[PDB]
Paper text:
Abundant filamentous inclusions of tau are characteristic of more than 20 neurodegenerative diseases that are collectively termed tauopathies. Six tau isoforms that range from 352 to 441 amino acids in length are expressed in adult human brain from a single gene by alternative mRNA splicing. Tau filaments consist of a structured core made mostly of the repeat domain, with less structured N- and C-terminal regions forming the fuzzy coat. Here, we report in vitro assembly conditions with recombinant tau that replicate the structures of filaments from both Alzheimer’s disease (AD) and chronic traumatic encephalopathy (CTE), as determined by cryo-EM.
Numbering used by the authors:
A (entry chain H), B (entry chain B), C (entry chain E), D (entry chain D), E (entry chain K), F (entry chain G), ...: 306 to 379
Amino acid sequence: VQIVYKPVDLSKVTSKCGSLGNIHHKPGGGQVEVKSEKLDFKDRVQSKIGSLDNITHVPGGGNKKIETHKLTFR
Amino acid sequence: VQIVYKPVDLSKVTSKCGSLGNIHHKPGGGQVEVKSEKLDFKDRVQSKIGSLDNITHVPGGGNKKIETHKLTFR
Amino acid sequence: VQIVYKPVDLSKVTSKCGSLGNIHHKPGGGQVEVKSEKLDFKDRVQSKIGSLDNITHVPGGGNKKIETHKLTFR
Amino acid sequence: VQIVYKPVDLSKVTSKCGSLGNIHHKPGGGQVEVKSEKLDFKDRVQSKIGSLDNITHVPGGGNKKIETHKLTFR
Amino acid sequence: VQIVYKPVDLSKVTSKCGSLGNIHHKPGGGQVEVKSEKLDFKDRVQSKIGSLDNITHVPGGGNKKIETHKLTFR
Amino acid sequence: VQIVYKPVDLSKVTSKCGSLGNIHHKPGGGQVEVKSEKLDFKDRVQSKIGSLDNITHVPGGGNKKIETHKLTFR
Amino acid sequence: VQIVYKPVDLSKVTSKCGSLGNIHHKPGGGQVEVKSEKLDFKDRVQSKIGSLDNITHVPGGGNKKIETHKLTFR
Amino acid sequence: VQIVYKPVDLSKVTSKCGSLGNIHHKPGGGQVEVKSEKLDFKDRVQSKIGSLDNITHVPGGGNKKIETHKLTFR
Amino acid sequence: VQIVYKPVDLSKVTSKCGSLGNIHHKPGGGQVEVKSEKLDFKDRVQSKIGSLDNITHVPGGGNKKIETHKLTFR
Ligand SMILES: [Cl-]
Ligand SMILES: [Cl-]
Ligand SMILES: [Cl-]
Ligand SMILES: [Cl-]
Ligand SMILES: [Cl-]
Ligand SMILES: [Cl-]
Ligand SMILES: [Cl-]
Ligand SMILES: [Cl-]
Ligand SMILES: [Cl-]
Ligand SMILES: [Cl-]
Ligand SMILES: [Cl-]
Ligand SMILES: [Cl-]
Ligand SMILES: [Cl-]
Ligand SMILES: [Cl-]
Ligand SMILES: [Cl-]
Ligand SMILES: [Cl-]
Ligand SMILES: [Cl-]
Ligand SMILES: [Cl-]
Ligand SMILES: [K+]
Ligand SMILES: [K+]
Ligand SMILES: [K+]
Ligand SMILES: [K+]
Ligand SMILES: [K+]
Ligand SMILES: [K+]
Ligand SMILES: [K+]
Ligand SMILES: [K+]
Ligand SMILES: [K+]
Ligand SMILES: [K+]
Ligand SMILES: [K+]
Ligand SMILES: [K+]
Ligand SMILES: [K+]
Ligand SMILES: [K+]
Ligand SMILES: [K+]
Ligand SMILES: [K+]
Ligand SMILES: [K+]
Ligand SMILES: [K+]
């Protein structure tokens, strides 16, 4: 047999942005009171009380190309 | 047999933006009171009490191409 | 046999935007009181009490192309 | 004689309020013209002409208990 | 004689408030003209002309107990 | 004689407030014209013309207990 | 001959104003589409297409006196 | 001959203003599309397409006197 | 002959202003598209496309007196 795997990719993933910015975070915490007695946990606990967790992600591009190729015999 | 896998991709994924910005987050926490007694958890707990969790994602592009190619024999 | 897989993709996915922005988030928490006694949980718990969870996603483009190609023999 | 003054006070005077606020005072003065000639005052004068006197009293509670106890011999 | 003054006070005067605020005063003065000629005052004068006198009293509680106790012989 | 003055006070005067604030004063003066001729005052004068007198009192509690006790013989 | 040009001008042109203001211009453009083909103009053209042309003239006085005096011999 | 040109001007052009201001211009453009083909102009063109031309003239007085005097022989 | 040109000017052009100000310009551009082909101009062109031309003139007085005097023989 003759098997030819010859895909052609000339594709563009592209951005232009002029000005990127002017982002202001001023979150304000509240008043939090937690009273706990006789609590049983048998498994994992993720707990957050009054926290101000922030992610700022501001890439000038942030473009992505995911591409996958296989030729496969089982 | 003769088997030919020859797909052609000339595709564009493209953006232009002039000005990207002027984003203001000013969330204010409230008043939170939690009283807990004799609670049993047999399995995983995710808990958040009065927290101000933020994600800001501002890519100048943020374009994506996902593409997948297979030739396969079982 | 002769089998030929020759699709051609000339496709455009495109945006133009002049100004993107002027976004203001000012949520205010209320008054929350929770009293809990003698609760049993046999399975996973997700709880949020008075939290101000925010996601701000503002891509200048945010366009996507998903494509899949297979030639397959079983 | 035996005289016993033994009153018992277990009284509650109580408030709960969630949010107290959003008060806007925007009074605008008019046009006032006063012309006075040959006036005699023999006694105290309180005069106000075109004034914008304000009291804003906004207690979160503002509850009161007044109590009086006497045992008295003349 | 035996005279016993033994009053018992276990009284509560109490408040809870969540959020207290958002008070705006924007009073605007008018046009005031006063012309006075040959006025005689024999006694005290309080005068206010076009003034914007303000009191803002915003106690988070502002609760009060006034109590008076006497045992008296004349 | 036997005279016993033994009053018992276990009384509470109490407040809780979460957030206290966000108070804005922007009073604006008007136009005031005062013309005075041949005025006689024989006694005290309090005068205010076009003034913007302000008191801001914002105690987090502002609770008060006034209590008075006497045992008296004349 | 004796010729005398002796006019006397004692004239007042006067204004009093207390507060002049509180002017808000918020015009919004609509949608305008103009398609033009094979037009000949032999003479001057003044054209405006979707413009938001504004004059704000707010003199505190803005009073005027125009006067003319001539004595003339031909 | 005797010719006397002796006009007397004692005239007042006068203003009083207390407060002059509080002027807000917030005009917004719309959507303008102009398509032009084969247009001939033999003479001057003034054109404005989607412009937000503004004049703000706010003189505290802005009063004027124009006066003209001639004695003339031809 | 005797010719006398003796005009008398004791005239006032006058202003008083207390407060002059609080002027805000926030004009916003819209969306302008212009497409032109085969246009002929034989004379001057003044063109403005999508511009935000501003004049702010705020003189504290801005009063003017124009006065002209002639004695003339031809
Ligand atoms: Cl909170
Ligand atoms: Cl916990
Ligand atoms: Cl908090
Ligand atoms: Cl809350
Ligand atoms: Cl919990
Ligand atoms: Cl829970
Ligand atoms: Cl009076
Ligand atoms: Cl008034
Ligand atoms: Cl006033
Ligand atoms: Cl008076
Ligand atoms: Cl004033
Ligand atoms: Cl006075
Ligand atoms: Cl035209
Ligand atoms: Cl328009
Ligand atoms: Cl426009
Ligand atoms: Cl044109
Ligand atoms: Cl042009
Ligand atoms: Cl524009
Ligand atoms: K909080
Ligand atoms: K907990
Ligand atoms: K905990
Ligand atoms: K909250
Ligand atoms: K809980
Ligand atoms: K809440
Ligand atoms: K007033
Ligand atoms: K008076
Ligand atoms: K005033
Ligand atoms: K007075
Ligand atoms: K005075
Ligand atoms: K004033
Ligand atoms: K427009
Ligand atoms: K045109
Ligand atoms: K425009
Ligand atoms: K044009
Ligand atoms: K042009
Ligand atoms: K523009």
